[PDB]
Structure formats: C-alpha cells, structure tokens
Design a protein around this ligand. Structure first.
Ligand SMILES: [Cl-]
Ligand SMILES: [Cl-]
Lengths: 274, 274
C-alpha cells in the first residue's frame, strides 16, 4: 500500500483545510501522509478522483461527498473509506459529522431572541445532508416561536458548483433579502457567510442597526471583523483527532462506528441590535 | 505513472489554494489531477512528501520549497519537477515566480507617500527567496525617499514553523511596532497581515488615524474589512494557468523556461490617513 491517505473535498471552505491539518498531525504518527484533492462540487471529478486513488492503492480514503445520493462502486470497496461532514443516502460506511439540526436551531433561535421574527436563511445545495440538517434546525426554531415558515426567506446555492459559486449565492440571496427589508440572516457555511457580508458591505446598511447576522464556521477574521462575527463553530480539532483514529482502525480492519459531534455558538457582536 | 500531479505547499495561505484551483482547472483538460499536501514549513516533512510521491510514481511535482537551500536526490530526478512562488539557490529546476522586489517597492512607496517616514516591515523567514526579494524592494523605496534603512523596523517569521507561527509573528511584531509609535506598516503576506490586524485591533489604535497598512495577497476579507485593505495583488489566475502549461510540457519531456510575472497594487482604504 501507498502511505497516502486521500482526503477528497468538495470545495475550498477553510473548514476542510483546518480539519485536514488536524488529521495530518495525528496521521504522521504512523507515517501516513494526507493528500487533498478537491472535486469542486463536480460529481464526475469526484468519481475520477476515487478511481485514481483506488488505482494507486492508497492506505485509505476520506470522502466528503458532493451529493448524498451516490453509490460506491463495488470495485472501490477494497480501499478503507469513511465519509466526513456529510453522509451518503444508503451505506454502512462510517462517518464523522456534527449535529447539524442543533447547530442551525441554536443559530436561528439566537436571531429570533432579538426583535427579528422574519429570518432569512442561506443554505448550500439541498442534495447535501448538512443542508437538510441545517434547514431542519431552522424550521424547529421558527416553530418553537410559533412562527410560520416562509419559503420566500430560504435561499439555496443550487445554480452552480464550487467555492465561488457558493459565495455568489450568499451575496445575491442577501442582496435580495436586504431589498425586502429583512433584518436577520443565518448563513449556514463560511462561504455563504462571506457572500452575505459582501452584499451587506456593498449596500448602505449597517450591522447591529439595519441587520443582524449569524454565520457558520469560525475564522481568525471573525474576531477582527467590524463588527465581530457571531458564528456556529465546529469542533475541527476533535473531528480531525477522531477521524485520524477512525481511519487508522479502518486501515487495521477493525470495526468502526459513526461519530456525531456538537457545535457551539460563539456570541460576539453581529447577532444583536445596538 | 499515475495521473496525479503533486502540489507541495508550505502553509495554509489562501494564496496557494487559489493557485491550486487554477492549476487543477487547466490540468484536468489532460485528465491529470492535482493533489495538495503541506509541509507546514518543515523540511523533513517536505522530504518525506517528495519521497512519498516519487515512490507512487506521480506524473509530476510542483514544489513550493520551504527553503532556498535544497538539492534533489538523484533518485527523484525521474519525476518531472518545478518550483512555484520560490526559487532555489542552485538548481536546474524551472520556476514560476513574481517580481518580489517590485512588489514590496510599490507597497513601501505607497506608505511613504503619506506623512509617515518610519515604516515597519513584516517578513517571513529570510531563508525564502520571496522574503529576500521583498526586503530588497523595501530598502529600495526607503533609499529613494532619502531615508536610511533601520534594521529595528524589520521583523521576521523565523522563530517557529507554519501557519500559526506566521500569524503570531505578524501579531508580536506589530504590537512591538505600535508600542514605539510607528505609523506605517507593510505586511508582506496574508498571514503576517492577519497577525498585524489582530495586534492593531487589540491596541487602542485606529487604521487611517493612528496607523496605515499595506498587505500582500488577495483575499475576500480585503474588500469587506473595516477599513478596506490595500494590498499587493498576485496574479493567481495567470500563475496557475501558466504553471499548468509548464508542468504539462515537462510531463511531455519538452523544454520549459522559467517565468516571472508582475504583481499589482490595489489601493483601497487602509493605506491613507483621513
Ligand atoms: Cl443531523
Ligand atoms: Cl525577485
């Protein structure tokens, strides 16, 4: 076997690179190197990447599926494989994920606990399990406040594929939301968040005054943004540590069960009105 | 010989993932896929990764060397190899780079156009060719304004290794520079810039009032930060496309010559006093 573990990502969300770094630190312990290849949300590219890594006989694959409706060819299954972040629609393939519903529930509830009772939602593609999880968290919070869901308020990145696609979706969605006088926004990944912030910046409107916002995925830049950004923070170190341990046991042929972790909200400045 | 191109990067500066996306887009026209692995500025790690990709018979390696003093093992010479971003001391390896002297020259001059006559410089490790080039450009601008080079105004990320090490170096240096009343700063990469912005935020001091700053490296943070960040922009699109062309020519056993590109200063808000 090659001493490479192939980490197949869907996009350039720093989230994946931060998890990578953790996986990598732990794996070099057993003289395993991690290599990363991005599918850019293209499914044909994802298939080409798996097929190359199988052919190369890598030690293992960690797949972040571009869509949840996807089957592993019988010919690939000789390689230890697990998924991360997202689940596939029907496998006994072990995964590592967070509680996506809780996460978006916490985030949505926080915006509601201000004056804002009509919350814009920015979602990625609904073919992804994390999108469905996050949509369900939003719905649950809305309902707890005895509000009606307004499908008008929910936007998806379902037009194009990849990193920049997601950013533009957040931007254009937010630009629309702001134009309707929406005052509260939950952006459910780092890139959708960056697009939201682009639209808000470009407009006249002032965070904490005209609009409030909760994002997902932390960065050192959230603490130095004006105003500081409240986000759902994912447990990236722990996820990386656990995935590295899950992947080692798979490489040794031991039984492994799926793990789900917990996010936490980091309250800063952007989620409350002055 | 597998259809994989290995891109070995020194840290998690978005500069490298941005170039990667461009390299990937072009190379996949030829059914070749780019996989990334980071040495995190560790030369042992770099060597391991090279040894690993050589053993797996990758089509090619694009190396971003952690340091200038590097020699190929003769066993490695069967696999086509170029360097990107950085040049080696003595080798036959083709490179693709920018004009680093001109980049830091333009940036320092921009700061010197203000009242400010003492300019802090944040640099990476001096054992990197881009660091030396950027230092030379700063010296040039200082001299052209008939000021003398003051070594105490220049900081280096050479105490620790990797991404966080460079952010922290940028933070500790800026804090020191601000403690001395320095009103003008050039941060010569995105990581040092981030560290600088942290230090500035922690201090009482306000950009455009108490201090001005010019950074390096395009980022989506730049247009949306408060104030908007002036930076030297690197031509990541051209760089990635041209490197993909170079590496393909190499894979085909054709002669390739080294390329040097030009950066450009994007003037926004952070580089002038109000
Ligand atoms: Cl869930
Ligand atoms: Cl140069």
């Amino acid at each position: 076997r090659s001493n490479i573990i192939a980490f197949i990502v869907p996009d350039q969300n720093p989230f994946f690179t931060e998890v990578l770094t953790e996986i990598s630190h732990e794996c070099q312990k057993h003289h395993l190197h991690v290599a990363v290849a991005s599918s850019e949300e293209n499914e044909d590219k994802q298939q080409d990447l798996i097929e190359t890594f199988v052919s190369q006989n890598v030690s293992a694959i960690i797949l972040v599926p571009v869509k949840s409706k996807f089957q592993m060819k019988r010919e690939w299954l000789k390689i230890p494989i697990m998924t991360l972040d997202r689940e596939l629609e029907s496998t006994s393939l072990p995964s590592i994920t967070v509680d996506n519903e809780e996460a978006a529930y916490i985030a949505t509830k926080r915006v509601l606990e201000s004056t804002c009772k009509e919350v814009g939602l920015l979602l990625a593609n609904p073919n992804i399990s994390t999108t469905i999880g996050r949509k369900n968290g939003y719905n649950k919070a809305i309902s707890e406040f005895d509000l009606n869901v307004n499908p008008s308020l929910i936007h998806y990145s379902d037009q194009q594929l990849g990193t920049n696609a997601q950013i533009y979706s957040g931007y254009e969605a937010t630009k629309t939301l702001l134009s309707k006088g929406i005052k509260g926004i939950v952006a459910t990944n780092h890139l959708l968040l960056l697009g939201a912030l682009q639209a808000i910046k470009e407009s006249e409107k002032e965070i904490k005054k005209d609009v409030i916002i909760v994002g997902f995925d932390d960065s050192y830049w959230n603490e130095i943004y004006t105003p500081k950004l409240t986000v759902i923070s994912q447990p990236v170190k722990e996820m990386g540590q656990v995935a590295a341990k899950m992947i080692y046991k798979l490489i040794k042929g031991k039984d492994v069960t799926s793990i789900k972790l917990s996010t936490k909200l980091i309250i800063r400045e952007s989620c409350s009105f002055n």
